[PDB]
Write a protein that binds this ligand. Structure first.
Ligand SMILES: Nc1nc2c(ncn2[C@@H]2O[C@H](COP(=O)(O)OP(=O)(O)NP(=O)(O)O)[C@@H](O)[C@H]2O)c(=O)[nH]1
Ligand SMILES: [Mg+2]
Lengths: 469, 166, 166
């Protein structure tokens, strides 16, 4: 077989037992275990699991502190070499050079793979979870000292590599595309005249494209640290989940802006034009696989102020009612259609984050942090593999970039959108609803008429792109 | 058989998902995976009649405030939850009730007020306060501890009874 | 949606990591940072069918036994890479092919011969030579450039089709 070091000088040698490591009922999958056992598997010498490394580096803070994680992997790296075998002693005692077949097998099959995987955990730690180091300066000094004490011709390759990555992170991403981005489309408003920009004056195709770029960047900016431990729901959410909250807020302001554009267009004929344009934007969103965008529109159409406008929707063409209906159907029966849709599209895409938040939360509130066995308290790692499975899925959709050209002014126009103004949620929400009652009173109150407000043609240019450029 | 769409509303952190979980999941299994089908349906017998509970839980999505109307509209009954150690969440109830009344376009919407005990912190809302608020709205008041599974079934079953008698 | 397990192997420095990050992020890694073991996930629609690609990026450093057989056990398709301006990397190809053929124990393991860095002008490996090797193994030969994306999808997706048709 192969003799491991003494469990008295190397803790990571204690044998597996029902009291320190539980496996899931084709590498083994850990259900639970001690921090020591978990770190042993994190850097095992038999197989490999980049998947374990991410799960661990993403969730360990709840069951082990950073300073402690580092001490532990340094101990893990510090493997003691075995004693000369009887054969070797015989040779040495005779003045000849020992073959040391066991020492060499032990270095090749245990030490090499373990030390390398420890360095690997260090590379990833520093490379994608550098925040642990920004918040703890001493932790970083220790990492540097450690990496700097690593002697060896072999290790040299990686030591240098990790040192550079560490410095690159202390000091302060270009994209190449298959084909070229389609030409930016203009309608009534022209380049430079940002004073005219509005829901109907900009080309609907372009509105969907620019919002899709905005929404995609917002999506790709959410880091796993903003999701783990359900921190976006704690009182320090503004500090721990800034990127997430920024993205959710954009979605809200956009849904509200859509609602405002509708209910503030008192004239029925013009409001119908407004609603049609929004449904057309929805159409392009589906095309671009921007589900976040599709839901913002679905949400607006289903809000109290808009939902009740029967006279408006009665005048919407069938092709569009159908588009809106299928879109609405995505969220029915607990997002069944949507989940299926998302699993089948060819990205890039911009998923709806709501689903992930709900699952991550239920997973954190429905699984114990530890599992007790014979008194001993093991770390419930399966709970962690479940949260990481979700953060991984989120990350998978963050890689693929959209091949769309940014239009600085339209982007700016949408970034400064502020439907609510200086009002508070309730006051504004009530305002929109009263407007809805004004433009289309509750039965049997008669339906009034109102003067038009738009001075430009309301005909949409349509959502089919043009070729010239 | 009949299916009741029950919706759990209330500020974030009050323990809405914990309630939903406590009711639907199997409390006698080491692992729970919310990313698995029908983790929202549950067949139960209430007052003899056998029905199917479909719980609409959106915990974690509190921030998507403009998606609220949509989520609510399909509910037939509502659990208005709040934390007993969180006065804010309690003072939030009034508006949650008004939002439900608006989206359902009705003044007689089946609902229950639920005071949940999340942790061992200092209670800051006394049940009398809640009882009185609940009475002014003409609705049932139920205190819970999803953490010890106390009062959970009671809160949902009471809501279903409200629907059956509406 | 089906899941495919791709493994990228080959001498250190040939561009195994660059090709993968170009595929996954449409970004060209211009600096050198030795790989120990990395994994990437990618959902993509190939030939009208939605796939979930699991790509394992290995360490080229040809002085790491044991760890090798370890990852070739699970992989179902292999990308054998060499740089067209590194004759030694091309001559290491047969080693990898033999090792896979052995680990997975079979003579028809789905693979693709990939000659990378075809953007560079200083070519020291002739397409004809590479091609001859691919024909001897009964696999396709695809020249790529992680820098310009040239042939990148072709290589990875061709491998997917081979795993599907195997
Ligand atoms: N001009 C050019 N340089 C390339 C190309 N692909 C990789 N390189 C360069 O070659 C070097 C090594 O690439 P890399 O992807 O790290 O190689 P690897 O095979 O993963 N190395 P290892 O096995 O050590 O992890 C880098 O400096 C990278 O930018 C290519 O197509 N063109
Ligand atoms: Mg590499």
């Amino acid at each position: 077989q192969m003799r491991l070091p003494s469990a008295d000088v190397y803790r990571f040698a204690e044998p597996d037992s029902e009291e320190n490591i539980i496996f899931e009922e084709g590498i083994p999958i850990i259900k639970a275990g001690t921090v020591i056992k978990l770190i042993e598997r994190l850097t095992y010498h038999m197989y490999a699991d980049p998947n374990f490394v991410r799960t661990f580096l993403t969730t360990y803070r709840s069951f082990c502190k950073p300073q402690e994680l580092l001490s532990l992997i340094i101990e893990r790296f510090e493997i003691p070499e075995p004693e000369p075998t009887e054969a070797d002693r015989i040779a040495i005692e005779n003045g000849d050079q020992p073959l040391s077949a066991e020492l060499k097998r032990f270095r090749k099959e245990y030490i090499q793979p373990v030390q390398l995987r420890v360095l690997n955990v260090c590379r990833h730690w520093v490379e994608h979870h550098f925040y642990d180091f920004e918040r703890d300066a001493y932790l970083l000094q220790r990492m540097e000292e450690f990496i700097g004490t690593v002697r060896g011709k072999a290790m040299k390759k990686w030591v240098e590599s990790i040192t550079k990555i560490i410095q690159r992170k202390k000091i302060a991403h270009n994209i190449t595309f298959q084909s070229s981005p389609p030409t930016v489309e203009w309608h009534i408003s022209r380049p430079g005249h940002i004073e005219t920009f509005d829901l109907l004056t900009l080309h609907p195709i372009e509105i969907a494209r620019q919002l899709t770029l905005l929404e995609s960047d917002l999506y790709r900016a959410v880091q796993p640290s903003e999701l783990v431990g359900s921190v976006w729901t704690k009182e320090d959410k503004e500090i721990n989940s800034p990127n997430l909250l920024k993205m959710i807020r954009h979605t809200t302001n956009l849904t509200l802006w859509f609602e405002k554009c509708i209910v503030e267009t008192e004239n029925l004929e013009e409001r119908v034009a407004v609603v049609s344009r929004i449904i057309e934007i929805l159409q392009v969103f589906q095309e671009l696989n921007n589900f976040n965008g599709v839901l913002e529109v679905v949400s607006a159409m289903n809000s109290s102020p808009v939902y009740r406008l029967d006279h408006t929707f009665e005048q919407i063409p069938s092709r569009q009612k159908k588009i809106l209906e299928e879109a609405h159907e995505l969220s029915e029966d607990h997002y069944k259609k949507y989940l299926a849709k998302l699993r089948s599209i060819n990205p890039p895409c911009v998923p709806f984050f709501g689903i992930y938040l709900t699952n991550i939360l239920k997973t954190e509130e429905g699984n114990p942090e530890v599992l007790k066995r014979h008194g001993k308290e093991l770390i419930n790692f399966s709970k962690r593999r479940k949260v990481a499975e979700i953060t991984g899925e989120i990350q998978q959709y963050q890689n693929q970039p959209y091949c769309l050209r940014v239009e600085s002014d339209i982007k700016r126009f949408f970034e400064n959108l502020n439907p609510m103004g200086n009002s508070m949620e309730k006051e504004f929400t009530d305002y929109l609803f009263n407007k809805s009652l004004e433009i289309e009173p509750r039965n049997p109150k008669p339906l009034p008429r109102f003067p038009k407000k738009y001075s430009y043609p309301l005909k949409s240019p349509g959502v089919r792109p043009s070729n010239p450029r | 058989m009949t299916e009741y769409k029950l919706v759990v509303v209330g500020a974030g952190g009050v323990g809405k998902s914990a309630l939903t979980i406590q009711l639907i999941q199997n409390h006698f299994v080491d692992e729970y995976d919310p990313t698995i089908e029908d983790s929202y349906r549950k067949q139960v017998v209430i007052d003899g009649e056998t029905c199917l509970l479909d719980i609409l839980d959106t915990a974690g999505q509190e921030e998507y405030s403009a998606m609220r109307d949509q989520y609510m509209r399909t509910g037939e009954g509502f659990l208005c939850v709040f934390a007993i150690n969180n006065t804010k969440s309690f003072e939030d109830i009034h508006q949650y009730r008004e939002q439900i009344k608006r989206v359902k376009d009705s003044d007689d919407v089946p609902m229950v007020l639920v005071g949940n005990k999340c942790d061992l912190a200092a209670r800051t809302v006394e049940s009398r306060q809640a009882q009185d608020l609940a009475r002014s709205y003409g609705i049932p008041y139920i205190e819970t501890s999803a953490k010890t599974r106390q009062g959970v079934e009671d809160a949902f079953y009471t809501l279903v009874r409200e629907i059956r008698q509406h």
